[PDB]
UniProtKB/Swiss-Prot annotation, chain B:
Residues 1-305 are cytoplasmic. There is a cross-link at K5, K90 (Glycyl lysine isopeptide (Lys-Gly) (interchain with G-Cter in ubiquitin)). Residues 1-305 form the Peptidase C30 domain. The active site is at H41 (for 3cl-pro activity), C145 (for 3cl-pro activity). Coiled coil: none annotated. This is 3C-like proteinase nsp5. 3CL-PRO exists as monomer and homodimer. Only the homodimer shows catalytic activity. Interacts with host FBXO22; this interaction promotes the proteasomal degradation of nsp5. It comes from Severe acute respiratory syndrome coronavirus 2 (2019-nCoV).
Length: 306, 305
């Protein structure tokens, strides 16, 4: 029993992190087979903050302008190309520690592990969720760009995030590993702001199901709700709409606990109305929204504590 | 910016985890040099679990009774012995992935990373603190015994915890890697209960400093206090006493933020007396006590491994 924000073991990703230098700028890259992936803004100068023309900056570079260091070893860059907002540096050595992997673009609400890195060397690992406004609430300092987010369902690493920048509110924006930004953000230092963020409703429900599995029922009630009335109430607290897809996705947790999804919805409605009145759920005094249904099933007993 | 509960990168430990089987029991072991460490309770069966005589259970076993798998490779056990509550299985091969390491015993309040494992296969990593009552609030299912906790101090892994059991309240108990329990617990299936826990004061203060560094300031005030007056408040709210050593340890964060420790104690006093009045601190509606001073400095500075 117990319930913690739990990351994937990071070793398969640690073996892929390198340092990329261009001019006076150093950040991190991801070395898979014979390609190093990193944010294209590594080629930007002080003059290129606001309106970089990346095509024009890149054509002026040779292979030997990029320094890639993997531990104590220099790799030799033998090619370069840009794909969307990522740079792909072809190197003369395949990474002998390359795991089985794939690149996946995630949807808001999905969670992943972040391996924060500086100078190509891992600092720490933590769990994040892609917020509804396409930001993440990470922990990143200068030099952390090119740190990646991933899942490891089975033995295969799914890379889903590469870190590019911090927005004025202190939240974080980045790309998939094909270099497409999450959300309406661009790799320019112009005024950009994330939209108002909302709570990830399906994840809160999942977490309430985790609480029941771990043996806590205090917040349930005798009521039910229609999906439409739930959404009308939940929107007034800045909760995302719950869809029929979300209801379907919660089916297994429902089945395991004997609590219908719309009955759990009625519990959530009452929690929003009442607060917790001095109580906690799985150790928290707020409703937690960074655990998915899949995360709950992965972490929790398949046997409910009745 | 930002502040997150963050574990050490786990790869140096992942390369040391193996599966240990004895009879119908499988759990995890730690393979360092030519020794595999695991809980001695692996040798227990159902009728023994109430009052095991470990000496007597062990003498009946041959080397070949212990099946050790490192990935898909069987290791050959060439010796077996007990140290306190851990079993030490001598194997014929040194682990080529053995990191620089030490065995250390930590103090209550100290944090560490746990690499949860099942069948010798790492499943997840999270940060824990050794509670004042010598339990940890972990997340462990059947098959997780022998999972380890660690810190990394440079390139050196300090192993500090091996998982043995779950108490009735759903919190967790285990040993150092020399097999000495944290807390007044024993390795048998009997009525055992955690003592009442307290809040780790120095760590709450550290976290308040993290909050200020990350721009969250509403709880600061004009007031200061003394160690003695604050300690009367701490005791009333089931907080650990704050010592002068704690004050010294927080010195850096005091200097950096311009909030003396006893000034921050006056903030904490008011929070304990009045609550948060609807507000949050670093996204929490409770006072967090599982970040140490060193954790806060390390994450607000970007140290790597
Ligand atoms: C750890 N891998 C694990 N998995 C299941 N369990 C529960 C029981 O197997 C515990 O068994 C014992 C524990 C102790 Cl502390 C003494 C004796 C026994 Cl049989 N643990
Ligand atoms: C990432 N490693 C990092 N470290 C510091 N910074 C701040 C600036 O250096 C980033 O500069 C740019 C960012 C973008 Cl998105 C476009 C252009 C530039 Cl110059 N980032
Ligand atoms: Cl005063
Ligand atoms: Na004060």
């Amino acid at each position: 029993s117990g319930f913690r924000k739990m990351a994937f073991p990071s070793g398969k990703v640690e073996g892929c992190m390198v340092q990329v230098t261009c001019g006076t700028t150093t950040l991190n890259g991801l070395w898979l087979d014979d390609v190093v992936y990193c944010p294209r803004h590594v080629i930007c100068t002080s003059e290129d903050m606001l309106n970089p023309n990346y095509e024009d900056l890149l054509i002026r570079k040779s292979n030997h302008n990029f320094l890639v260091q993997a531990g104590n070893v220099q790799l030799r860059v033998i090619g370069h190309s840009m794909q969307n907002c990522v740079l792909k540096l072809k190197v003369d050595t395949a990474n002998p520690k390359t795991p089985k992997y794939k690149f996946v673009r995630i949807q808001p609400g999905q969670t992943f592990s972040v391996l924060a890195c500086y100078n190509g060397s891992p600092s720490g690992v933590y769990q994040c969720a892609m917020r509804p406004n396409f930001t993440i609430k990470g922990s990143f300092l200068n030099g952390s760009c090119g740190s990646v987010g991933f899942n490891i369902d089975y033995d295969c690493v799914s890379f889903c995030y590469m870190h590019h920048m911090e927005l004025p509110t202190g939240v974080h924006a980045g790309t998939d590993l094909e270099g497409n930004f999450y959300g309406p953000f661009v790799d320019r230092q112009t005024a950009q702001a994330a939209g108002t963020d909302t709570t990830i409703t399906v994840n809160v429900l999942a977490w309430l199901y985790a609480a029941v599995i771990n043996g806590d029922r205090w917040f349930l009630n005798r009521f039910t709700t229609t999906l439409n009335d739930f959404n009308l109430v939940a929107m007034k607290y800045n909760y995302e709409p719950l869809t029929q897809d979300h209801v379907d996705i919660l089916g297994p947790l429902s089945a395991q606990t004997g609590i219908a999804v719309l009955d759990m919805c009625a519990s959530l409605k009452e929690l929003l109305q009442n607060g917790m009145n001095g109580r906690t759920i799985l150790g928290s005094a707020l409703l937690e929204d960074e655990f998915t249904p899949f995360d709950v099933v992965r972490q929790c007993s398949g046997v409910t504590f009745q």
